[PDB]
């Protein structure tokens, strides 16, 4: 049987470069993939390798992981905006549109890493079965 | 259908050969001063040649 | 080309090998450097001394040389593909490429024109005409006021 999956949770160095792309003008995505990669240990590496026996199947599985981490990141940012509005933050009109006040703002990177870690724990739970 | 009706009426039938004679282009006139006939070797000559 | 080459480098020679030598290249560099220093003088590309007239004979000879080059390729292929011993050489020379290319030059070319034949003066002018266009000359993408 297969019940071994240790998540490499919580690190200050989980926010140190995730924005790295091999190429110019970094944008969203390719930080999501790094986010859910660094959230899993090499034990999870080997577990994913052994559990799924097909390259297209693992490919689709990684796409599903990307999709779910993106969805949870989106919902976490939505709830953060909601609680900021409930905490007294308003919408500041900049030349990009609405934002929140700096004292009420954090950053998207830590939200993404938290979402990736929670999804990593979810995948571990699905893999310890 | 109208052409078929007319050929049935007049008793005429389609010609086996179509006219392709060289006409003088409209707008020009004049006298035929010279006629050249070139028939390749191995092909029967005609009277004019 | 050789006589102009020696003329612009101020040599008493007016003849020599067509292919360049290292000395000629070095002389060209020295002359260009002297002009850069202001000692030399530039030469117009519009002076009739720098523009040469290829009459009918020279153009025909150049095109015939091109035909000889392609038939040379054919001959060199044949000399190894064909017999390396006695075989009659008329069977290995091809008249089609040379004649076809010569006919292409004389018949269908930028500088082979129907003689404008409505006056004796027209014929004389056409035969005396000098064209800056054609193969190896100037395209109409010009003006380019200098040459005009």
């Amino acid at each position: 049987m297969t019940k071994i999956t240790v998540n490499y949770t919580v690190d200050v160095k989980d926010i140190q470069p995730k924005h790295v792309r091999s190429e110019s003008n970094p944008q969203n995505q390719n930080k999501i993939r790094r986010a859910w990669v660094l959230s899993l240990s090499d034990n999870a590496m080997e577990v994913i390798q052994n559990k799924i026996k097909s390259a297209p199947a693992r490919h689709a599985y990684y796409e599903a992981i990307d999709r779910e981490v993106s969805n949870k990141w989106i919902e976490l940012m939505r709830k953060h905006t909601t609680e900021s509005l409930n905490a007294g933050a308003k919408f500041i009109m900049t030349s990009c549109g609405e934002r929140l006040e700096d004292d009420y703002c954090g950053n998207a990177d830590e939200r993404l890493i938290v979402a990736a870690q929670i999804v990593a724990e979810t995948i571990a739970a699905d893999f310890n079965r | 259908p109208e052409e078929k009706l007319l050929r049935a009426i007049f008793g005429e039938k389609a010609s086996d050969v179509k006219d392709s004679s060289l006409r003088v282009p409209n707008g020009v006139s004049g006298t035929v001063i010279d006629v050249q006939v070139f028939t390749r070797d191995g092909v029967e000559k005609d009277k004019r040649a | 080309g050789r006589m102009k080459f020696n003329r612009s480098l101020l040599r008493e020679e007016i003849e020599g090998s067509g292919i360049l030598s290292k000395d000629d290249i070095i002389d060209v560099m020295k002359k260009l450097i002297d002009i850069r220093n202001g000692k030399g003088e530039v030469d117009d590309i519009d002076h009739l001394g720098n523009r040469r007239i290829r009459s009918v004979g020279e153009m025909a000879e150049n095109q015939f040389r091109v035909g000889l080059v392609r038939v040379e390729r054919a001959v060199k292929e044949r000399l190894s593909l064909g017999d390396l011993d006695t075989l009659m050489p008329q069977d290995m020379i091809n008249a089609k490429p040379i004649s076809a290319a010569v006919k292409e030059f004389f018949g269908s070319s930028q500088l082979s024109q129907f003689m404008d034949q409505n006056n004796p003066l027209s014929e004389i002018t056409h035969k005396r005409r000098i064209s800056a266009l054609g193969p190896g000359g100037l395209t109409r993408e010009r003006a380019g006021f200098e040459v005009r």
């Binding site: 559990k51 | 007049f10 390749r40 | -």
Partner: protein, 472 residues
């Protein structure tokens, strides 16, 4: 290389530069490993009975004179007598091996594989045996993957546990009870899908019965097969990659004569692969010599097909080439021109066929070429549309239709009605005489008499004058 290049020719040369040329004995060594691979796959087919049964069926068909002898076998490693003797002893070995199924069996299998070692068969029959064994692999893996899908998606268990427990017999109820023995929840869940799994196991056993061998031996033999064609394909690809330079050198001679060089080398590579599939060193010749003719044939085929804008048959292309060569010969001999009479004399071909062939040998020209040697107008700007009816003729047709309709209106009811469907006047359909008669409930000479009466009535110089103008 990475040199801001946009020419496939350049980096094709880069690709061919990586592989180093071979020597004469290098080709022999590569063909030797190819022969080892093909002998391995032949032994794998040998251990498979059904392909041999199919081969014997075709041998029997040939003996019945229903198939060509040269479409089954080509040469042997020491003719109808040799083929008959080898197939007779081969049938004997096959039956003596099959009897051991339905120590000794291993010896019979070894002797069987040995007696196939003499056979050298046509590539088509060998490819058929390979495809049959491949579809055996496909069906075996399909049954295994069906069991996979059922046990995994219906019982919610990981793919890792299945491999250890199921493998070893794979066609019995032992693993069912073995997995149940641990009282696992998925073992209990398997009891609701056990019927489908058992039915699939029954189909697997039926497949084994069809093969006549246990499924484990099927896997062993097919894995030996797979490694066999893997080695063979690797060696063949090595040969093809190492011999690209010959293709490039041969094609560059044909490039000066029109057609893209890249297409020529691609076709030459196709011919090179064909030669590699057909190459042998038992002949004793050099591989380059054999591949040269194949590449030349491929290049000639490419020039015949993909270089002519209009299709010209290969034999017609060869006739054109012969005509051109003889024309050049006569031109350089007589020194004046190729006269059609001598061209007719040299060929068996009359001369009118010669001139029509000469017309065919020329390729179509673009309209984008300027008419008059670089006038800013193109050739296609002058081509008249001959498929368009002139408005003069369209107006004439309209007036004729109006006149015919008026004239038919000038006749009686039934006569005009018969005429309308007889010739298809003013409807988009035409009807035969008997078809009109059936609707007029009169199927006799009467309908044609009515038509003739209408014609005779139209003969009068009161209804024909209006139609007289149209036909002069």
């Amino acid at each position: 290389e990475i040199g801001r290049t946009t020419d496939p020719v350049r980096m094709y040369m880069r690709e061919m530069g990586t592989v180093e040329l071979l020597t004469r004995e290098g080709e022999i060594d590569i063909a030797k490993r190819i022969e080892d691979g093909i002998n391995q796959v032949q032994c794998s087919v040998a251990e498979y009975p059904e392909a041999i049964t199919y081969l014997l069926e075709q041998y029997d068909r040939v003996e019945a004179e229903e198939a060509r002898l040269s479409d089954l076998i080509t040469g042997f490693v020491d003719d109808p007598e040799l083929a008959r003797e080898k197939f007779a002893e081969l049938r004997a070995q096959y039956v003596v091996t099959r009897d051991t199924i339905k120590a000794t069996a291993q010896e019979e299998i070894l002797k069987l594989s040995e007696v196939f070692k003499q056979f050298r068969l046509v590539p088509k029959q060998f490819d058929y045996l390979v495809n049959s064994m491949r579809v055996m692999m496909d069906r075996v893996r399909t049954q295994e993957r069906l069991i996979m899908k059922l046990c995994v998606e219906q019982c919610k268990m990981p793919k890792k546990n299945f491999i250890t427990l199921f493998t070893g017999n794979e066609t019995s109820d032992t693993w069912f009870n073995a997995a149940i023995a641990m009282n696992k929840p998925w073992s209990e869940k398997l009891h609701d899908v056990s019927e489908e799994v058992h039915r699939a196991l029954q189909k697997l056993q039926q497949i084994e019965e069809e093969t006549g061998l246990t499924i484990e031996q099927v896997k062993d033999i097919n894995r030996r097969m797979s490694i066999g064609e893997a080695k063979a394909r690797r060696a063949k690809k090595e040969m093809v990659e190492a011999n690209l330079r010959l293709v490039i050198s041969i094609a560059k001679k044909y490039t000066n004569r029109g057609l893209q060089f890249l297409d020529l080398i691609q076709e030459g590579n196709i011919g090179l692969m064909k030669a590699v599939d057909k190459f042998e060193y038992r002949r004793g010749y050099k591989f380059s010599t054999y591949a040269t003719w194949w590449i030349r044939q491929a290049i000639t085929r490419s020039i015949a097909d993909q270089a002519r804008t209009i299709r010209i048959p290969v034999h017609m292309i060869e006739t054109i080439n012969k005509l051109n060569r003889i024309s050049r010969q006569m031109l350089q001999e007589m020194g004046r021109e190729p006269t059609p009479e001598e061209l007719a004399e040299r060929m068996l071909m009359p001369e009118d066929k010669i001139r029509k062939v000469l017309k065919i040998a020329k390729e179509p020209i673009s309209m984008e070429t300027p008419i008059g040697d670089d006038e800013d107008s193109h050739l296609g700007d002058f081509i008249e549309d001959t498929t368009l009816e002139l408005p003069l003729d369209s107006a004439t047709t309209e007036s004729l239709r109006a006149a015919t309709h008026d004239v038919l209106a000038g006749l009686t009811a039934r006569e005009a009605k018969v005429l309308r469907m007889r010739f298809g006047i003013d409807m988009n359909t035409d009807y035969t005489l008997e078809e009109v008669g059936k609707q007029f409930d009169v199927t006799r000479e009467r309908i044609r008499q009515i038509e003739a009466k209408a014609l005779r009535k139209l003969r009068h110089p009161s209804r024909s004058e209006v139609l007289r103008s149209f036909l002069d």
